[PDB]
Amino acid sequence: KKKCIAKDYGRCKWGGTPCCRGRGCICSIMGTNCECKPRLIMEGLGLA
């Protein structure tokens, strides 16, 4: 699976380059500041 950004926190876009290592291109929920973070999913607002 080539064509991606294996750079942790690698600026990426949902319509441009994805992440290699397996990061998730998370943005600022506004359409700006998109980046590929090292798979992060820590909830709690619903757990507590």
Side-chain angles (χ1 to χ4, degrees):
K1 304 300 219 295
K2 318 200 157 141
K3 227 242 176 309
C4 47
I5 300 161
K7 298 189 103 93
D8 291 87
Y9 263 103
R11 275 227 248 271
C12 122
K13 4 199 270 239
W14 312 351
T17 344
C19 338
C20 291
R21 257 254 219 274
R23 320 313 234 274
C25 217
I26 253 55
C27 223
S28 248
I29 221 190
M30 213 93 221
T32 8
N33 260 296
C34 286
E35 291 208 313
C36 273
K37 269 193 282 123
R39 208 176 130 170
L40 254 181
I41 286 102
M42 206 151 177
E43 248 188 76
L45 42 136
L47 222 134

